[model samples]
Target: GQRWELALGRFWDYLRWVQTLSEQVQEELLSSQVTQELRALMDETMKELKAYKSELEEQLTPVAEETRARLSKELQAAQARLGADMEDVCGRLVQYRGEVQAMLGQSTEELRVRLASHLRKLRERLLRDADDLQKRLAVY
Candidate 1:
């Protein structure tokens, strides 16, 4: 939208300018057979680009499918690891809560506060590592 022509009254003149350019380029190539061959090569590359893009895309398909298969497996593995880790922590939390309650009484403030803080830290750390694995699961 920040086009230079936007400031000037040149908005509708673009097609005419492009038409002029096409005319000039054609005139140039037609003026010389050497120019024609030069044009032909540049033209060939452009032509080649147009020609081979579909073939290139087709060739890349299996590569993408295989990589996707690998990444999908790796990502699922990261998720499973996270689930297992969280489950282990949750089991420990139950055991620890019972111990803390038996020692400090059920209505203790310090116990709950400490557990909350510790859980937050452990959970954050676990998620960071889990997510790091998840991030690495993408193409590298």
Candidate 2:
């Protein structure tokens, strides 16, 4: 129902956080300090996003619920190895300590694209469901 209005607002914040993360990733050089900080930020963001998602899930019906479940699965799959990869990167950074290779930036862009696609899809779905609710209520 229109309860998604609250969830959608939270989703917008999530999207903006992702955008900020990607920008930070781009501008950042590989350092243990930077990587650790980013990883902490990501961990917190992911945790909050999951909380918001579960909250939304409670209010959804079968159709929208299924869609969200599918979306969440896709998102989880996308980031399944992201933490491991970041750990490896950090480990390498500690060893090499800013080798000046742009590979991390490249990888971040790859993640950004994938994350952006799913996030955009989620936004579209939320909008569609919200509009659908508006119409149903108006008809009543």
Candidate 3:
């Protein structure tokens, strides 16, 4: 092979630049502040649901003596499972982060587009579930 001056140094510089670029671009999409804020948002949503459940329970207690309130039982069961569902929803974000990091070699803009799309879908599902649950509670 023909000798090439500074070839190894150039390759080393390129490698480091690629890593720096990946890290900064990834940070633009996955900043710690954003992650923590997303978590806080979910926790607030969970707390609101819990508050509604408590309100329903208080209203339900007076009715409990007259006869078995099927609506009350259904609401209690649903609220109980809601906690687990919320945990699963948050767990999915953790999984998504892993996938995002693993695929960092792709173009940064492409990764960001897909990442935002993924988050939008996640938010839609979360909002849809909360809306459906609240509607059910309202009916009873």
Candidate 4:
């Protein structure tokens, strides 16, 4: 129960941080000068951001589900440290962690390299997401 709660809490924090970043982008858009080139760049960035966001959500959803299942299954293992089942669960956790981390790491590295080539496209998506959130917040 503790581990499950911890994992969920961490995930919630992550999503909250992303929301905060989106909001910040919206604030930037309101103050920044909007030239034609800037607008076009923003549009492209928004598209890429939407794609990246979708990819992230898709990847993380399964990971969270798998984590819940694994944690639930392991909660009652008699020999948590030495039991074959426990060992298998631990192995699976390690494997899952590796897979998720690899995906995240690769994305981070790719984004870094594309800063010059894709900066405008990336920024556009972030601003769009931010604007969308602002609208949602207004409703709330």
Best by TM-score: 3
Give me the overall lDDT of model 2: 0.47
Q: Write model 2 residue lDDT over 1-140, tens digit each, in one string.
A: 24434444454454455345454544553434555664565565456545655665566555576765676565554344433443443454344334335355344555445545654554455455445534433332
What are the lDDT scores of the predictions, listed in order?
Answer: 0.43, 0.47, 0.50, 0.36
Q: In candidate 1, what are the lDDT values of residues 1-140, reduced to their tens digit? A: 22211311131132123223244532332344323333333333333333443343444335477776786566556555644554544454555446554775455456545655665665566557545643553232
* TM-scores for every predicted model: 0.39, 0.36, 0.53, 0.22
Is candidate 1 or 4 superior in TM-score? Answer: 1
lDDT by residue for model 3 over 63-139, one digit each (tens)?
46434467767666665564555455445545555666787666446655565566556545544654565666766
Ranking by lDDT: 3, 2, 1, 4
| Residue 109 error, candidate 3, Å | 1.8
- Following a full C-alpha superposition, what root-mean-square deviation does model 1 have from the true structure? 29.0
Please give the lDDT score at residue 92 for candidate 2.
42
* Candidate 2 local Cα displacement, residue 35, angstroms: 1.4
What is candidate 4's lDDT per residue for 1-140, written digit by digit as tens? 33322432343343233224254532332343212223444344344434543453444334477765564344323112212322232233334334545676454334323332343343344345444433432332
